[PDB]
Amino acid sequence: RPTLPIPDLLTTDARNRIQLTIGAGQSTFGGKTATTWGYNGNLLGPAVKLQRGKAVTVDIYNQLTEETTLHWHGLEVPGEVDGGPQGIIPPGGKRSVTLNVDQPAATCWFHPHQHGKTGRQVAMGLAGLVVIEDDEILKLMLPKQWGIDDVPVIVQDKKFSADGQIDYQLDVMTAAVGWFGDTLLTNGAIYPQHAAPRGWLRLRLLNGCNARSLNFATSDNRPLYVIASDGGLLPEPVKVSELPVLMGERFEVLVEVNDNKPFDLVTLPVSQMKMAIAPFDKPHPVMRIQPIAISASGALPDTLSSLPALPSLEGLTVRKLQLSMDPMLDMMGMQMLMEGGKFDFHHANKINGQAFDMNKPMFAAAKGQYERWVISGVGDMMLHPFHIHGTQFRILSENGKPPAAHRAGWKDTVKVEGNVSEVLVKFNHDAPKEHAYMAHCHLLEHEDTGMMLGFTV
Ligand SMILES: [Cu+2]
Ligand SMILES: [Cu+2]
Ligand SMILES: [Cu+2]
Numbered sequence: 001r002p003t004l005p006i007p008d009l010l011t012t013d014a015r016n017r018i019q020l021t022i023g024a025g026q027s028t029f030g031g032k033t034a035t036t037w038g039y040n041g042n043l044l045g046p047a048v049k050l051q052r053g054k055a056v057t058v059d060i061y062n063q064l065t066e067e068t069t070l071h072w073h074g075l076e077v078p079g080e081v082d083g084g085p086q087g088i089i090p091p092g093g094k095r096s097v098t099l100n101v102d103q104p105a106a107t108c109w110f111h112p113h114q115h116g117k118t119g120r121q122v123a124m125g126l127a128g129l130v131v132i133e134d135d136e137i138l139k140l141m142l143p144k145q146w147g148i149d150d151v152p153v154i155v156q157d158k159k160f161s162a163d164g165q166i167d168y169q170l171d172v173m174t175a176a177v178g179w180f181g182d183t184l185l186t187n188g189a190i191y192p193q194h195a196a197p198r199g200w201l202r203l204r205l206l207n208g209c210n211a212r213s214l215n216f217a218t219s220d221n222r223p224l225y226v227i228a229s230d231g232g233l234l235p236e237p238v239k240v241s242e243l244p245v246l247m248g249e250r251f252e253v254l255v256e257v258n259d260n261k262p263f264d265l266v267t268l269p270v271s272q273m274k275m276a277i278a279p280f281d282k283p284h285p286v287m288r289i290q291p292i293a294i295s296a297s298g299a300l301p302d303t304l305s306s307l308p309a310l311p312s313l314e315g316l317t318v319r320k321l322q323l324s325m326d327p328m329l330d331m332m333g334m335q336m337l338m339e340g341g342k343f344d345f346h347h348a349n350k351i352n353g354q355a356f357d358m359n360k361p362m363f364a365a366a367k368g369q370y371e372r373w374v375i376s377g378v379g380d381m382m383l384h385p386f387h388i389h390g391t392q393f394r395i396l397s398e399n400g401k402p403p404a405a406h407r408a409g410w411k412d413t414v415k416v417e418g419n420v421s422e423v424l425v426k427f428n429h430d431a432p433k434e435h436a437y438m439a440h441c442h443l444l445e446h447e448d449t450g451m452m453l454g455f456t457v
């Protein structure tokens with residue numbers, strides 16, 4: 001097997017600046033070449049390292065032939081750092097953002113957020129990581145050696161035509177169910193191997209698929225110790241035998257590498273509608289872990305962090321959000337699960353009856369105050385991972401039930417699938433009308449066909 005590629009861990013240079021170049025290039029999958037996009041390279045991107053309480057300047061150079069944006073998924077930052085329309089970077093253009101990090105240590109990520117083409121630009125290969133560190137986590141003695149016992153694992157699927165090129169098409173069908181592919185990639189490679197020393201191995205898991213849910217496990221069913229979610233550490237490690245991960249979500253897990261016994265990270269079959277699984281739906285391997293005689297120094301503490309109690313729900317504003325899809329998309333989405341009109345579909349999917357409008361923010365949210373957002377997909381049976389910018393929130397109810405323990409800490413994504421979710425959000429930064437925050441489904445094709453709203457703080 002090829003070895004697991006390891007994204008560069010970028011820090012500031014001498015002038016407190018980090019340089020990101022958006023460019024097209026060539027990658028090779030299974031023998032055949034493919035035109036890919038990357039940040040500082042042909043595919044994916046580096047891991048930008050940030051320190052809490054400190055500022056960096058990021059210089060972005062769009063060397064593509066079309067417009068793009070750079071959204072910092074999971075960063076609590078003013079709306080300006082994404083920008084709105086000012087956040088567009090034309091081909092050959094450049095754009096500078098200063099990032100002030102004041103949130104707990106976490107794994108976030110960044111990717112394009114272009115109006116209507118987010119799904120395509122991610123499909124082409126643009127995604128990078130953000131590694132946030134603070135005082136608290138560095139005292140914990142977790143495995144921390146980048147690319148050795150602390151490794152990023154970006155899992156994506158891609159659909160390749162027979163010429164080996166990426167086959168993306170935002171047609172009427174992919175707008176209903178999302179863009180799916182038959183090739184599973186880990187950090188760009190097909191089923192790579194990572195050599196890991198004995199002791200604890202730390203995996204930063206990102207589901208970077210356009211539309212596919214993942215369910216991570218090990219081949220020999222050894223447990224995964226969840227230590228962090230989207231927003232950072234849990235109060236204590238949460239042991240699981242399998243780990244569902246929605247599109248755009250991150251979890252950090254420790255896995256025990258206790259012998260010379262090599263094992264696989266796998267993703268398990270996922271129920272499509274609430275539906276059964278025949279044995280010829282099989283687990284697919286993601287990455288092979290190969291132990292080595294070196295013993296690593298990382299540890300797993302009994303206590304990881306301190307999460308504040310949920311504030312009382314009395315006195316908090318309630319904002320309702322109703323996700324809906326065009327019934328034709330939903331219906332034709334089920335016909336495919338087993339297998340008319342003029343109908344523009346670029347604004348088919350809606351929130352509160354409105355397809356997204358770049359100039360029309362749906363409301364303003366309070367700054368520095370917890371609000372109670374209730375997001376419902378009741379009229380619909382498809383999975384919608386709902387993402388909100390500018391915050392790390394607490395899930396009160398996920399799809400009708402209180403969250404699982406490993407999903408009860410800091411999150412920026414919540415499952416909405418035929419039911420109602422309730423989150424507890426606080427926004428610490430301004431986002432005026434020209435630089436408005438977004439809230440949207442992170443099945444990218446749904447977001448490109450209207451399922452998004454802007455809001456100001
Ligand atoms: Cu995102
Ligand atoms: Cu501005
Ligand atoms: Cu801040």
Ligand SMILES: [Cu+2]
Pocket residue numbers: 281282284
């Ligand atoms: Cu399969």
Ligand SMILES: [Cu+2]
Pocket residue numbers: 115347356357358
């Ligand atoms: Cu539009």
Ligand SMILES: [Cu+2]
Pocket residue numbers: 383384385441442443446447451
């Ligand atoms: Cu959706």
Ligand SMILES: [Cu+2]
Pocket residue numbers: 071113387389438440
């Ligand atoms: Cu977004």
